[PDB]
């Protein structure tokens, strides 16, 4: 209820989170199955996705899962690593409290342990060569890091597209980028290893009459949301009018106004036109003969999103349509949907760097889910690469070396923060122990063998063979993690543990 026993209960809740995240980290981690009240079932290795809907059992677990969720953009792969590391911190913290140490003192011991961890971690590994220009060792990094987990087979294309997309947007903000401009559009219906780079926005493409060949000749786009195309309130209808002569006259007036805005469209030069609504198919064929791409069933929000993207301002009304205000789009292209039945619109200008998204195919719901998870992990890890290019030599090697350094520096502390240093060192030791326990290897045996290999051989890059390949040098496998990702991992874990410790009651 109160005091140290209440904190022990908090520790038990944290262990409840940690022991279930224990089997999930690493490429060989055991996936969980996520079920909602609707009954939908999906399997996933991503700790972030597991925690996205992991419901509360006791409150502090909800607090800590919210804390972990709040760093998804920067933490990248290893958020489940963050959770298990913090759980190990709390598990050894329970031993420290059994030894009688007040919680705030193990908390500030952990923060100085994180400080010395950061100091050693800045010195733990070398820097990769230049990012923006050569990109080939970065291709190697993206292969050996991302395509190893759950994708059917690692191959160059997804990584190359991701790195190209980031490098188109990486250098302006003093070697930085914001993911507000890069997004994923998952659309099942094509071959799994077929995906295209998109320096623009994807929209569902309809021709009001498909009689004319698939083609595109974009020089500028008419971004219209006005009754230029006869509007409909999204209702099924089949019209009738007082007389066929009246219908003929209505068709004539339709084509006269279409021609006068042709003059409006051709005076600005927007050879492509788009609108939410569309007329009937035969008149739309006649419309396409007039060299304007009549479209229908265009996504509602997508229209103004692409309008703002293309530098134009959307046109809701006839009286608001001006020649200068239309969007100066660079190019439009017919991306094949994998299947030969249809194609999508992409609106993109190569000159302007903004809005470089990814357009992906898929065969199944959970498979495209893991595909977008993997590409988002690629995106965040390459943000960590571009922010600064020095690696951490991950896969347990960073954890084991950092724990060795913290244990070495432990005895240099004159106060019981020394015991806190030992606790933090053991918690870091747990991560290679976890990577072995979930894998098919005895945890402590191989973990301490890696420890000794680093003690006797002067290279901290030697870690645990999570991929079960013969070589044990983490450089030889070239499987790697960013230093910045590890910086955020350790800092988030220590902030999480200290926030849990500072809480005491209810």
């Amino acid at each position: 209820l109160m005091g140290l026993e209440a904190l022990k209960s908090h520790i038990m809740a944290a262990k409840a989170v940690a022991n279930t995240m224990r089997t999930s980290l690493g490429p060989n981690g055991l996936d969980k199955m996520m079920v909602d009240k609707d009954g939908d079932v999906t399997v996933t290795n991503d700790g972030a996705t597991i925690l996205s809907m992991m419901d509360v059992d006791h409150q502090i677990a909800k607090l800590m899962v919210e804390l972990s969720k709040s760093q998804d953009d920067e933490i990248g792969d290893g958020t489940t690593g963050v959770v298990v590391l913090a759980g190990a911190l709390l598990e050894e913290a329970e031993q420290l409290l059994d030894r009688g140490i007040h919680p705030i003192r193990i908390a500030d011991g952990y923060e100085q342990a994180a400080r010395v961890a950061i100091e050693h971690l800045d010195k733990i590994s070398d820097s990769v060569l230049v990012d923006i220009k050569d990109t080939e060792p970065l291709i190697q990094t993206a292969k050996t890091t991302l395509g190893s987990k759950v994708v059917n087979s690692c191959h160059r294309q997804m990584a190359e597209i991701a790195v190209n997309a980031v490098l188109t947007v990486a250098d302006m903000e003093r070697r930085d980028v914001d993911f507000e401009l890069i997004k994923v559009e998952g659309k099942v219906g094509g071959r799994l290893e077929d995906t295209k780079l998109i320096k623009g926005v994807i929209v569902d493409k309809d021709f009001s009459h498909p009689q004319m060949p698939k083609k595109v000749e974009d020089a500028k786009i008419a971004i219209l949301t006005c009754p230029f195309e006869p509007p409909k309130p999204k209702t099924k209808h089949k019209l009738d009018v007082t007389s066929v002569e009246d219908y003929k006259a209505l068709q004539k007036y339709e084509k006269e106004k279409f021609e006068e805005m042709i003059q409006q469209i051709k005076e600005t030069g927007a050879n492509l036109a788009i609108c939410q609504w569309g007329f009937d198919d035969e008149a739309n064929h006649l419309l396409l003969q007039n060299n304007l791409p009549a479209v229908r069933w265009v996504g509602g929000p997508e229209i103004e999103l692409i309008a703002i993207a293309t530098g134009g301002r959307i046109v809701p009304r006839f009286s608001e349509l001006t020649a200068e205000k239309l969007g100066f789009a660079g190019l439009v292209q017919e991306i094949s949907f994998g299947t030969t039945k249809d194609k999508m619109l992409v609106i993109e200008q190569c000159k302007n760097s903004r809005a470089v998204t990814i357009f992906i195919r898929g065969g199944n719901k959970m498979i495209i889910e893991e595909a977008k998870r993997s590409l988002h992990d690629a995106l965040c890890v390459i943000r960590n690469l571009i922010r600064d290019n020095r690696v951490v030599y991950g896969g347990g090697a960073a954890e084991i070396s950092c724990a060795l350094a913290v244990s070495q520096e432990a005895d240099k502390c004159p106060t019981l923060e020394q015991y806190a240093m030992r606790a933090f060192a053991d918690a870091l030791e747990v991560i290679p122990m976890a990577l072995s326990e979930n894998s098919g290897m005895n945890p402590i045996q191989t973990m301490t063998e890696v420890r000794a290999r680093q003690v006797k051989e002067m290279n901290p890059a030697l870690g645990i063979d999570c991929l079960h390949k013969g070589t044990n040098d983490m450089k030889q496998q070239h499987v790697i993690e960013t230093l910045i990702g590890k910086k955020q991992q350790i800092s988030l874990a220590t902030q999480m543990v200290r926030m849990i410790l500072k809480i005491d009651d209810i």
């Binding site: 279930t20 089997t23 060989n28 055991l30 996936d31 969980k32 199955m33 996520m34 079920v35 909602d36 009240k37 009954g39 079932v41 399997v43 809907m53 992991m54 419901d55 089949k238 019209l239 009738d240 009018v241 007082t242 007389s243 066929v244 009246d246 219908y247 198919d281 035969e282 199944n364 326990e437 979930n438 894998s439 098919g440 290897m441 079960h468």
Partner: protein
């Protein structure tokens, strides 16, 4: 969590496995008067109420790739369940799950390689194709009770599928659900058949069958922009409801006549007063149609598919040369004589029972499928227990060479795969252990073709008996069971909303 559900679903499917299995009865909740007896485990898996999330995800992972190939369900589900039970024993013996995953991946690679090596090609010879197709039909049509009717299905399906000789027509094959005469004989349509009446109001031998292919049929009426003069203005004139019906009929029928087509096909039953309207107007509307009929018309006579028909050019002038009707069963059934067989076909069974026809059509669907890919393919493997036990022997052989701890997992995989012919024998009542052990001896000492003859419960040299199973279905069931067992195994804990 522990795999109680994943083995419970397998156990409840086990007794249905293969021919001479055990039946299941499925009944509706609430103690209402409705139940049915079924042997096909796929039917149980379709009708099962999966209260266990592990069982739900297992049956879902099966369904995406089990009903496609056909008849694999009763094998893939049982093999996956036995794998999960053996792996539960392994994890009880403190074997880590990822070790088991790696061991099973390598073991499945070895088993698939052994299956490919043992698979025998049968292309380039017509008589070998004939015998193989009858054998595979008999093994896939292993569901009907009447053995002469079993042979009827075998011959009919084989002759329907072989007449292709080319790329698949499974998209165009159909099995008409119309009730006929004796429940022991089968038939095939020389031109695909409909349940539509012919002769009383429409011509008998329709030369120049136009065959407009429509989807948006008339439930009651349609519309065209003409300036209607409706007489039923409001509640004050409800007695004038009929006034607009004639206009709504004519303003479409007249323009379709100018299009040049009386052969209006659509799914929707054009009613009796519209039957008067269409018959007098000189249009022969066919009130039942489907995607399958349109695509068969396309494949057989170079046609195409249409949709949302309002414009005449949006549908094809499906110039079928002539159409007749035939006298099979207790109906006057139109029979499209123009679309001859060889490019596509439709099978029809005689028999006055829907529920028997249900299992019939299920078995012919799975057959027609496996027949289609095995004609598209060229290889088959000795069926029964021969193929699976051969793969189990290969897994055992390569398992002994494996140094790692996954050797135990490989042996567990071999035992679980060996359990499948054990279940085949157990459902047939024979001494399962004796049969499987003597089979292990019979094709472990070489003699790779030796199999278990379930027809008498003895060792059988499968080379001459002819009981064979197509290579594609065996490879698909092997890979699907492997991947489903991996998916079920690799999850250790579950949480729910």
């Amino acid at each position: 969590t522990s795999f109680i559900g994943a083995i419970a679903i397998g156990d409840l499917v086990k007794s249905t496995l293969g021919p001479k299995g055990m039946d299941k009865i499925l009944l509706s909740s609430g103690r209402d008067a409705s139940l049915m007896v079924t042997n096909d485990g796929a039917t149980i898996l379709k009708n099962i109420g999966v209260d266990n999330p592990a069982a739900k995800v297992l049956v879902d992972m099966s369904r995406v790739q089990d009903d496609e190939v056909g008849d694999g369900t009763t094998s893939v589900t049982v093999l996956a369940a036995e794998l999960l039970r053996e792996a539960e024993s392994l994890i009880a013996k403190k074997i880590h799950p990822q070790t088991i995953i790696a061991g099973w991946r390598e073991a499945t690679k070895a088993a698939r390689e052994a299956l490919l090596s043992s698979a025998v090609d049968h292309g380039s010879d017509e008589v070998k194709f004939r015998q193989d197709l009858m054998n595979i039909a008999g093994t896939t049509l292993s569901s009907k009770l009447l053995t002469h009717h079993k042979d009827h299905f075998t011959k009919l399906a084989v002759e329907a599928v072989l007449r292709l000789k080319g790329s698949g027509n499974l998209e165009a094959i159909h099995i008409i659900k119309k009730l006929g005469g004796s429940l022991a004989d089968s038939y095939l349509d020389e031109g695909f058949l409909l349940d539509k009446k012919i002769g009383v109001n429409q011509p008998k031998r329709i030369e120049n069958a136009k065959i407009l292919i429509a989807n948006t049929g008339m439930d009651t009426d349609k519309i065209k922009i003409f300036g209607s003069r409706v007489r039923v203005d409001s509640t004050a004139k409800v007695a004038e409801i009929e006034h607009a019906e004639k206009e709504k009929m004519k303003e479409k029928v007249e323009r379709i006549l100018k299009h040049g087509i009386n052969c209006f096909i659509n799914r929707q039953l054009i009613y009796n007063y519209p039957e008067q309207l269409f018959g007098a107007a000189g249009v022969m509307a066919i009130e039942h149609a489907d995607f399958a009929g349109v695509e068969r018309l396309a494949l057989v006579t170079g046609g195409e598919i249409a949709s949302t028909f309002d414009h005449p050019e949006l549908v094809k002038l499906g110039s079928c040369k002539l159409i007749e009707e035939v006298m099979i069963g207790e109906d006057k059934l139109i029979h499209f004589s123009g679309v001859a067989l060889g490019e596509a076909c439709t099978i029809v069974l005689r028999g006055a029972t829907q529920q028997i026809l249900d299992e019939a059509e299920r078995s012919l669907h799975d057959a027609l499928c496996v027949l289609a890919q095995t004609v598209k393919d060229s290889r088959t493997v000795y069926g029964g227990g021969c193929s699976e036990m051969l793969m189990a022997h290969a897994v055992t052989q390569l398992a002994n060479r494996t140094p790692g701890k996954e050797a135990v997992a490989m042996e567990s995989y071999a035992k679980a795969l060996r359990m499948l012919p054990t279940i085949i024998a157990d459902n047939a009542g024979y001494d399962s252990a004796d049969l499987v052990a003597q089979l292990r001896a019979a094709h472990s000492e070489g003699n790779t073709t030796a199999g278990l003859d379930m027809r008498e419960g003895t060792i059988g040299d499968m080379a001459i008996l002819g009981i064979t199973e197509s290579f594609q279905v065996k490879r698909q069931v092997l890979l699907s069971a492997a991947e489903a067992a991996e998916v079920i195994l690799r999850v250790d804990n579950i949480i729910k909303a």
